[PDB]
Design a protein around this ligand. Sequence first.
Ligand SMILES: Nc1ncnc2c1ncn2[C@@H]1O[C@H](COP(=O)(O)OP(=O)(O)O)[C@@H](O)[C@H]1O
Ligand SMILES: [Ca+2]
Ligand SMILES: [Mg+2]
Lengths: 142, 802, 155
Amino acid sequence: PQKQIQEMKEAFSMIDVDRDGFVSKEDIKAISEQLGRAPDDKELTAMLKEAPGPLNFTMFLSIFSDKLSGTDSEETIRNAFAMFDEQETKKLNIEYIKDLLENMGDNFNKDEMRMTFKEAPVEGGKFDYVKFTAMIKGSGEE
Amino acid sequence: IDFSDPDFQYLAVDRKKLMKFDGKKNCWVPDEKEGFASAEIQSSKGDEITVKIVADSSTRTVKKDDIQSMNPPKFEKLEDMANMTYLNEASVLYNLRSRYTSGLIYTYSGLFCIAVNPYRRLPIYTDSVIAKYRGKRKTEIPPHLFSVADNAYQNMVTDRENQSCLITGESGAGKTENTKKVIMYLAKVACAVEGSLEDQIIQANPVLEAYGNAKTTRNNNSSRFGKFIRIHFGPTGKIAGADIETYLLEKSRVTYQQSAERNYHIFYQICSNAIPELNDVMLVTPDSGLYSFINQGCLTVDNIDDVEEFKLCDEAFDILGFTKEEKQSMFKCTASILHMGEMKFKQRPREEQAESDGTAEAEKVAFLCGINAGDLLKALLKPKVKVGTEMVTKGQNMNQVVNSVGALAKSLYDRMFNWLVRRVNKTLDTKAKRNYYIGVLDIAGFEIFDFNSFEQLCINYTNERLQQFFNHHMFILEQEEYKKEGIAWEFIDFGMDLQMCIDLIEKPMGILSILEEECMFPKADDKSFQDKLYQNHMGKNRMFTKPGKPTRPNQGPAHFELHHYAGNVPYSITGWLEKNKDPINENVVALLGASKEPLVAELFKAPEQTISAVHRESLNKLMKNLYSTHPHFVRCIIPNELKQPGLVDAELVLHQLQCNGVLEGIRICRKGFPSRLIYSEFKQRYSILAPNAIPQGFVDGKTVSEKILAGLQMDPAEYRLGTTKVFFKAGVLGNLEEMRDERLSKIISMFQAHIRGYLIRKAYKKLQDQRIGLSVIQRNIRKWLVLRNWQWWKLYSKVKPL
Amino acid sequence: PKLSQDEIDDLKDVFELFDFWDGRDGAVDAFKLGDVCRCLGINPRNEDVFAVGGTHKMGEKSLPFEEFLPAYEGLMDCEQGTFADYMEAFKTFDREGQGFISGAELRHVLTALGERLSDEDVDEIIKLTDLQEDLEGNVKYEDFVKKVMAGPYPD
Ligand SMILES: Nc1ncnc2c1ncn2[C@@H]1O[C@H](COP(=O)(O)OP(=O)(O)O)[C@@H](O)[C@H]1O
Ligand SMILES: [Ca+2]
Ligand SMILES: [Mg+2]
């Protein structure tokens, strides 16, 4: 939490499309409508309860620290994956990690699976957990 | 030692090729065509055990006690069955055909030396072979006849004791050949430096073959007499000389012959016309079919050259020294027995007593015999019986007369043959002193038939003493062993219940007693003899029982059952009286006594003897000798009734083994401590049964053993500890075996299980780790997914390239 | 037989890990029951585990902890080979008596006798224990015995 908290302020510049140092229950949908698809108004009211302080830039930060909470580092993850690669190839086989995620631990379901590998980096059978790791941590791109 | 040497081709086999099994399930089962059968136990329901037969894969139910223990492959073609873990009817019958089919015919089994008839000559009896057996113990080389003989010779020299080799067995089991070989081998290792002496031990065979041999349904050169040939040696162990003894010659043959059977070869040689010069000396016409004492069964023999053998027989005599006058006396007497059979009579003049129907033959007889056909026939018709101070002229009919003739023939032949044997001995005898001998016996072994008569009894009763002779021996060897190992115990000789059957027969009140007594009486008969038998011995002797019925399909009549060690034998006394004593004109004899022919003269000279009474006498002689010597036993066995090599008839072999002496040798021996190992071997075999008890440092082998047994909860009865080795009751090593494999297997597995434990346990550490590992991997991938699929994230994350 | 609530705490420990390695759900594939006990120090025989509920394949039976205990306490009352038990055992392949044996034979004993070991499993424990055949090609089994007995992590 350092330099991009100022960037959350830069990403406060488009929050504030109409400039009021705030964003009404529709200010948000206005910015959304101006570029892609449009969120529900009941997707505007049913969420009225996530703001321990209405909403500005210093509340956009703090109403998100409920989701970015419970994460592990980039080296911590790229080591958990390293626990299944004794030969230090920086690569798990595809059928292996899949079996690993689907049939052991907290078994992924048909969907979470379908969704995790949809954009997973796999070349000639090998799954790159290093590169994959970055994707998952904002060091790469989703 | 031994390896690949050619001579051992038909002696040893590839121990490595025989090298290319569950005790609980594998076993022998009785099969009607193969004696026994290999089988794998299925289930059990008390005594009701069901199994599978490897050969046909079927099923049959068999009483548990019916089942016989099977030996591990570890004991295939074992040279001496005295070592096999399981020693029985089946394990023996198996180890026998197995070897025999591989070409092996000499198999040990303790003191015995079982030899299965080859029915084909073998490369085993060569000089070089002879040389590798010279001086070697039996455990030092493949089972062979030569070793019984050699180990016999080097036993004589070493111990300075007489040696006796007893060959036995059914007819055609090849005991004569074995005996010749024994003799040859003894001559080939103790030679001296007409012709050589041993040359005559060799040429005596022919003449004796001509009179004691004949073709019979079983064999083609069957010795029909018992023989005890002694060989004597000097102080330097070389052959000093020999002598012979005959026993029960088949007199019957001289006048009767069954289909596919001839009379003694001599009669056919005599009518071979191989020596024309003699036909006139004998008054014979070179066509045997013509004569009625030999034209009964068949006349020729596939492998017998009635002409060659005759020429050789002639030379044999010349090589034996018989003068021509002697050799011819024999020839004449023999030929005359052909005329006696062609001497016919008339019965009904007007009076109803008999009278000759021609003299032409009677004359030819009187000629060769050296008498007066007149005197001859006069006496053959109206004899001069004698009693007290009066000599009556008894008259006899056709029957009495024609039967008299045949009796004269038989009687003459026996007398003759006996003379010949005595003669031959005169030759083979030496006037030098002899230090020790080694005698080879050879008489028909025990045998039971559908109809056993007087003859069979004579033979069985003999082997009876003989078998008792063996047991005694075994008994002696057992003791000296036990005493040797400080473990001697609850004993009594083996020749025990063997004695009762024996007394029932030879002793004063005995059977043969009643027969010889009842023979002095005139109008005695079966019923009178039968009466007296039952009288003195029925319901008073356990060995003597009344006929129970048939134990085989073609068995016949019987009057009494004799409990021989070989089994209860049904003897029918029909005929015994006529057979025992030999009716012959006490008159004719007087005439032939006064014959002018020098030999016929010796043949009928006056004394001062019934068959039964003669035999038990010359048997007493024998046994008294045998007991003053060192035994060796060679059991001859016929594989099948087809002279076919390799063919093995189970029932036939199993049978022999029974009365053979082997199965009893097993039994009398079973009551002691058969299986016996030496502490060393015991340790390296059964430590596995008690590892956790062996203090740890190479302890003394009896202690290791004293412990394995002690710890094994070993019952004191089952075993007994020597000083050099440990003895065990029969089949115990069997249990010690199974108990050995279960454990060995379990131990291995417990190790295999300790190894598996080592592995897993090693990966535990990594599994503990990898958990947190995958735990991270899984959870985070899940946060990222909720994020990505957040309505505020794609929104936000879209809110920024700018 | 009866278990130390401490020796029971070790079991939950392991039972859990294993429940996890085939998906956390309070169950454990029977075909792991043996392996779980092994992780405790028990050295079951296949016959032993199949005898208390163990199975041959993955995915036939599944066991809550509740059943593992009874099953576990059972495996404890089984036979565990001793040093001697193994020694005399191997000693029976050693003709001479010096304590060696054709590594081939050894490979044979383990993969051919008793309840056979998979080559991958033998090949595996020669490296782990670090067995090494002399020039001629024979092994000194006494060492190979105490190694296995010793364990992955000695003292
Ligand atoms: N030990 C043996 N070696 C070779 N053949 C034997 C042996 N014993 C018996 N035989 C067989 O026995 C038979 C001999 O029968 P026989 O006519 O009485 O003898 P011989 O040839 O001396 O006149 C042959 O068929 C032979 O193959
Ligand atoms: Ca589970
Ligand atoms: Mg606004």
